[PDB]
Amino acid sequence: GVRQYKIHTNLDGTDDKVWDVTNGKVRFYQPSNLGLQSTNNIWQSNGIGVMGTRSITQPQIEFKLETFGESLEENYQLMKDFVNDILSKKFVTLEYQTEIFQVYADLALADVTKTEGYGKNGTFSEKITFDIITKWYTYENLTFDKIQNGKVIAGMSKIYGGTAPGNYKYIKGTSYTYYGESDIDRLSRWDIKEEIFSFMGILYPKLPKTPAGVRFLDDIGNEYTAIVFKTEQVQDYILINTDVNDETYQGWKGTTALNLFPVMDFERYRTRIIEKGQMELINLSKAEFKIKRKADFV
Amino acid sequence: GVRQYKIHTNLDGTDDKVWDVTNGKVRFYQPSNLGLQSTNNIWQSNGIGVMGTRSITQPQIEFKLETFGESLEENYQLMKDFVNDILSKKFVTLEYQTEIFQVYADLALADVTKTEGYGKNGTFSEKITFDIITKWYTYENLTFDKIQN
Amino acid sequence: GVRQYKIHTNLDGTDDKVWDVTNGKVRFYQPSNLGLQSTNNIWQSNGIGVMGTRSITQPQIEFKLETFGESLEENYQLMKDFVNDILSKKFVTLEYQTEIFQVYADLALADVTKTEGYGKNGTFSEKITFDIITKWYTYENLTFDKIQN
Amino acid sequence: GVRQYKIHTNLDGTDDKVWDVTNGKVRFYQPSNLGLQSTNNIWQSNGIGVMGTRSITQPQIEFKLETFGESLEENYQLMKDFVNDILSKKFVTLEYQTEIFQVYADLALADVTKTEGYGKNGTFSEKITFDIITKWYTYENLTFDKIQNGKVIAGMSKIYGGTAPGNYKYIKGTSYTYYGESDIDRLSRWDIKEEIFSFMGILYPKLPKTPAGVRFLDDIGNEYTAIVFKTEQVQDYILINTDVNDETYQGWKGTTALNLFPVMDFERYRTRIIEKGQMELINLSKAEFKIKRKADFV
Ligand SMILES: [Sr+2]
Ligand SMILES: [Sr+2]
Ligand SMILES: [Sr+2]
Ligand SMILES: [Sr+2]
C-alpha cells in the first residue's frame, strides 16, 4: 500500500546492512525532489525551432531525517551509527518501493546536519542531503530460457505412419510441419530484451586453462563484448560485477578469493553497455545473473 | 465553450497517443505565460530612435500538473506513465483549443517535480516546466482547387 | 499499535452497523477534547478551604470528518449514508480502541456541516459535533465462577 | 456530473419562474452550511446519561450572489429583477440537484446586500442570506398501482382439465394455486410507503352532492384523516394543497375558481401528516398526485 524507503550499505553484497527509513528508529521524510531536470539545447532562428541534445540532469535529494530514540543516550547512538555507516561505504543505495515499482538509486553523502534543538528524550529533526550517482535502476534476476519440442500429430507432422511402409501427405496449409529437434535440450537462450548498464554474475567454470566467462551477441549474431578469463586451475565460481564504482573480477576456490583482472582477455571486453540480443556462456557449467537497467523517471 | 489542452506524443503520426490535460486523469492548470517577449534592437542617435530587427523570444511554460487517481497505486501509475511518454518522444505537441482557434506548440520537457506531499488517496500536485521549440502553428489539410467551365 | 475509532448504530444489538472512522471511506480526525471538566464547589473562608461536591462535566467532541470517495457521486452517497445512519438511531456508540484499552461512549448528533469546498473528485472536509450521554464505559462479558474440591 | 442550484418562485404552480443560480446570469456560490444542528436535551443523573427528544434545528444559508451582465444597465436590471421576484412570493423554493439526488428547500429572504464595488461592466458580488422554513424535501409524482392476473398452468392451477370430466390434483407444495381474480381491473392501490407531510392533488369528481375527496387508510384498514367536500354541482376538478404556508382547497368548474373551505368536513380532516398505509378515492373518476416528503440531511 504505502511507500517504503530503504538504505543499503553495499547492495549486491554479502556485507549488506539495511536501514528502514520508513519504519525503523532513523526515518527519512519529505524528499525535496524525486523528479528530473532536462536541458534540451533549443535555440530558435526566425520563429523556427531547432532542438539539440537533451542532457537529463538529476537533482540532490534532501530528506527530513528524524530519530525515534527512548533516551538522550539512545538518540545520540542512533545518529552516530546511521551517519558513519553511510561514510564507511563510498556510496549508498536508496531503494524506492511502492505498489507498482521497486527502483534503486546510488547516492553519495552531500550534507548532514547536527543541532541542539532536541524535543522529548533528546529526539533529532535534521536535514540530510545526497548527491545523485545514478537515479532509478531496476535490480532484477536474469535467467536463461528453455526450448521444448512440439507434440507429434498424425497427418500434421513428418512421420511415415499408419499403413506399411508408412506415409505423409502434402496438404494445403496443414501439410507437414516438423515436430521438434532430436535433443532440443541443447538450446538455451539468455535473452537481453532492453539495454543494460551493470550486472552481478556468479559463473561456474567447467574446464581449467580454457577461457571461461561470458560473451555478448547482437540481434544479427555478432560479438560486441566478452568478459573472459584464462585461469590455471578450476575456480569453484567467478564473481563478476560490471558496476563502474566497484568493478569486481574475482575467482573463488574454496574460501580463497583471487584477483582475475590481469588474467582477463582485454581485447574481447570492448564495452560494459549490453545491447539487445543474447548472452552466450563460454566454458561454463552453470551461471547466475543479477541485471540492473536504468530508468530516468519513475 | 471553455479551453481545451491536448498533449500529443506524435501529431501527424500513426503512433500518436493523446493526453487530455483539461478532462483526463492527468491535468494541466495555471499556465505561467502564453504570451511572448521581443528584443527590438533599438539604438538611439542624438535622441532620435532607430529600430533594428525584432527577435521574438518564446518563454518556458510552467503548468500546475495535478493527478486524479482513485488509489495511491493509480496516482503513481499516472506519474510513471505520463512523464515517461513525454520522455519516449524527443518532443511533444501541446494543442491549445478554444471557440475561435486550434493552435499547437512543440514542447520539450524542461523540469518535472515529484514530492511526498499528498492529499487524499495519494493525490499529486506538482509543477511541470516545458521548453519552447515552436510556439503556435496551425496544422491543417492542404488540397488542390478545380476549375469549372 | 495505533488508535482505532469505530461508530456503531445500535451496539448490544443484532441490527448493528459499524463504521470505521479510522480505516474506512468516512474518517474522523483531530478530536476536540477527550478529557473532562470538573466543578468541585470550593469556597474559601479566611484562607481556609472548604470543598463541596465534584460534578464531573463532559464536553462536546468535535471531529474533522473527511470522506475518501472516488467520484463526486461516491463522495455525496458517503455523506448521505453516514449522517442518516446516525440519525436513524436515537444515539450512537463511539468506540475508542488502543493497545491498553477498549472504551465506548454513547453520543447524540449535535452538529454536522456540509459545504461546497471540494478538493479532488469531490472530497469533503467537514466538522461533526457530538453531545455526551455517557463518556467511557467498558463493555465486558460477565460469567459465573465454579468451585472445585 | 456537477451540482445544480435552481430558484423557483412557485413550485407546484403554473406561474413558476425558474432562476438558474448554477448556469444563468444570476449565480449562487459558496453556501454557508447545508448540514444541520440538533438539541438532544441530555440531562445526567449521577454520571449516567438520559436522552430526551432531538429538536433538529436548521441554520440560515448564506450564498455569495454574483451577477453576469454585459453592461452596468444589465447588472442593475438583474439585481432589481432577481430580488423583487423573491419578494413577490412570500417564500421561495431552492432545488439542490446532483448525480444521486434532487432535494428542495423552502426559503424566506433573510438579508440581501447591494454595494458600489463593481468589477468589470458593473459586475456584482453580494451576500444573500435565507431563513429555513423546510429543509430538504423530495418532490415526486405519486401514482396508483395495478394488479395483474397470474398465468394458468396445468396441474398447478385450479382448473378441471385434460381427460374428461376435468381433473385437479392435491399435491404436496405444488398442489392447486388460484390463477387470479375475475375482473382484477377493479383492484388499485395508491400506496404510501414512507410518512409524507404536504401534497398537491388534482381531484376529478364523479357525482355531485356526494362527498368527493380523498381519505387515508392506515396499515389495518382504518381511517385517520380525510379531505372530503360536499359540492352542489360537479366540479371539473378539485385542487387541494396541504402546504402549511399556502393551503388551497378550490373547486374549478370551467374558468371559474370556487373556494371549498366551508363545504369541507372539518371533523374527518384530523391531521395533515400522512402515515404508512393506502389512500382511497371517495366519489372520484381520476386522480393526479404530487407528494412532497421531508429528509433532514441529504
Ligand atoms: Sr556493491
Ligand atoms: Sr512527428
Ligand atoms: Sr442498544
Ligand atoms: Sr405553492
Resolution to one decimal, Å: 3.9
Across the interface, do A100 and B131 touch by the CB < 8 Å criterion? no
Any idea what DSSP says for residue D127? E
Which grid cell sits at B148? Answer: 469549372
Classify D254 in phi/psi space as left (phi over 0), alpha (psi -120 to 50) or beta: left
CA B30 to chain centre: 12
* B53 → chain A, closest CA residue: A46
Contacts of C110 in chain D (CB under 8 A): 37-38, 40
Whether A297 and B133 lie within 8 Å, measured CB to CB: no
Contacts of C112 in chain D (CB under 8 A): 35-36, 297
The DSSP element (H or E) to which C72 belongs, if any, is helix C72-88
D240 with D158, same domain: the answer is yes
Q: How far is CA D255 from CA D235, D249, D287, in A?
A: 11, 16, 20
SS3 A245: coil
**Range(s) of the domain holding residue A221:** 136-298
- Conformation bin of residue B92: beta by default, left when phi > 0, alpha when psi is -120 to 50: beta
For residue B76, give the chain A residue with the closest CA: A100
Residue after which a domain boundary falls, among A75, A103, A135: A135
Q: Chains with 3 or more CB pairs closer than 8 angstroms to D?
A: C
Q: How many domains does chain D have?
A: 2
Of the three residues A103, A135, A167, the one that is the final residue of a domain is: A135
Grid cell digits, residue D182: 375475475
Q: Which amino acid is at C132?
A: I
Containing A180, the helix (H) or strand (E) segment is none
Query: Grid coordinates 541443447 are at which residue?
Result: A186
Q: Which residues of C touch D (CB under 8 A)?
A: 56, 72-73, 76-77, 80, 83-84, 87, 90-91, 106, 108-117, 126, 131-134
Distance CA A139, CA A292 (A): 5
Breaks (C-N over 2.5 A) in chain B follow: none
What is the whole-number distance in angstroms between the Cα of residue D261 and the centre of ligand 4? 17
Answer yes or no: do D144 and D75 share one domain: no
Structural element, H or E, at residue A79:
helix A72-88
Q: Which residues of B touch C66 (CB under 8 A)?
A: 120
Nearest to D99 by CA among D31, D3, D221, D194: D3
A37 vs B contacts (CB less than 8 Å): 110-111
C114 by DSSP, 3-state: which? coil
Q: Cell numbers at residue B56, please?
A: 521574438
- CA-based nearest distance A119→chain B, Å: 24
Beta-carbon contacts of A261 under 8 Å, excluding residues fewer than 6 positions away, are A249
* Cα gap D88→D63, rounded to integer Å: 20
**B116/A49 CB distance under 8 A:** no
Q: Tell me which residues of chain D have a C-beta less than 8 Å from any C-beta of chain C.
A: 1-3, 29-38, 40, 42, 47-51, 54, 98-101, 296-298
Which ligand is located closest to the Cα atom of residue A11? 1
CA distance A253 to A255: 6
CA dihedral in degrees (A221, A223, A229, A230; nearest 10)?
80
Type of residue at D61: I
CA distance to A112, D15, D294, per residue, from D273 (Å): 74, 27, 11
Question: D116 and D186, same structural domain?
Answer: no
| Closest-CA residue to D43 (of A200, C131, A97, B128) | C131
CA–CA distance, D95 with D107 (Å, rounded to integer): 11
How many beta carbons lie within 10 A of that of residue B55, not counting itself? Answer: 14
- Domain end position, chosen among A105, A135, A165: A135
By the 10 Å C-beta count (0-12 exposed, 13-18 middle, 19+ buried), B97 is classed as middle
CATH of the domain at D140: 2.60.120.880
Cell numbers representing residue D248 in the block: 388551497
Nearest-by-CA chain B residue for C118? B120
Residue in chain C nearest D32 by alpha carbon: C115
**Residues comprising chain A, all counted:** 298
Q: Do B115 and A30 touch (CB under 8 A)?
A: yes
Contact A126, A116 (CB under 8 A): no
d(CA B116, CA A136): 17
Residues A125 and A253 in one domain: no
- DSSP code per residue over B43-93: EEETTEEEE---EEEPPPEEEEEEE--SSHHHHHHHHHHHHHHHHHSSSEE
For the four alpha carbons of D268, D271, D275 and D281, in that order, the dihedral sign comes to: positive
Contact (CB<8Å) B77/A54: no
CATH code: domain of residue C98:
2.40.30.210
Domain shared by A131 and A117, yes or no: yes
Q: How close D159 gets to chain C, by Cα (Å)?
A: 45
Whether D90 and D164 map to the same domain: the answer is no
Q: Is the CB of residue D33 less than 8 Å from the CB of residue D136?
A: no
What distance in angstroms lies between residue A87's CA and the mean position of ligand 1's atoms? Answer: 15
Best mutation target among B23, B68, B120 (most C Cβ atoms within 10 Å) is B120
Rounded CA separation B71/C25 (Å)? 12
Considering only alpha carbons, which residue of chain C is nearest residue B118? C120
Do C5 and C92 touch, CB atoms closer than 8 A? Answer: no
Give the three cell numbers for residue A138: 531496476
Looking at the structure, tell me whether residues D231 and D196 fall in a common domain: yes
Compute the distance between CA of residue A140 and CA of residue A144 in angstroms, rounded to an integer: 13
Q: What CA–CA distances, in Å, run from B3 to A105, B35, B98, B101, C122?
A: 40, 16, 5, 10, 22
- Residue D146 dihedral angles phi and psi, to the nearest 5°: -105, 150
Half-sphere exposure of A88 (CA within 13 A, CB side): 12
| A131 and A142 in a common domain | no
Are residues D40 and C116, on separate chains, in Cβ contact within 8 Å? no
Q: Are B94 and B20 in contact (CB under 8 A)?
A: no
Residue B20: exposed, middle, or buried by beta-carbon count in 10 A (0-12, 13-18, 19+)? middle
B26 vs B3: CA distance, rounded Å: 16
The SS3 assignment for C79 reads: helix
- In angstroms, the CA D12 to CA A135 distance is 67
Query: Using the 8-state DSSP alphabet, how is residue D274 labeled?
Result: B
Strands (E), A3-124: 4-8, 18-20, 26-29, 36-39, 42-45, 48-51, 55-57, 61-67, 92-97, 102-112
Sign of CA dihedral D30, D31, D32, D38: negative
**D172 CA: distance to closest CA in chain C (Å):** 35
User: Residue type at C38?
Assistant: S
Query: What is the CA(A286)–ligand 4 centre distance, in A?
Result: 89
Residue D117 contacts residue D125 (beta carbons within 8 Å): yes
Task: Give the three cell numbers for residue B71.
Answer: 488509489
Residues D166 and D216 reside in one and the same domain? yes
Residue type, D225: T
Distance, C-alpha A46 to centroid of its chain: 46
> D178 and D38, same structural domain?
no
A237-241 vs A248-253, strand pairing mode: antiparallel
Would you say A157 and A178 are in contact if contact means Cβ atoms under 8 Å apart? Answer: yes
User: Do A54 and A149 belong to one domain?
Assistant: no
Say if residue A39 is in the same domain as residue A112: yes
Cα distance between residue A242 and residue A265, in whole Å: 15
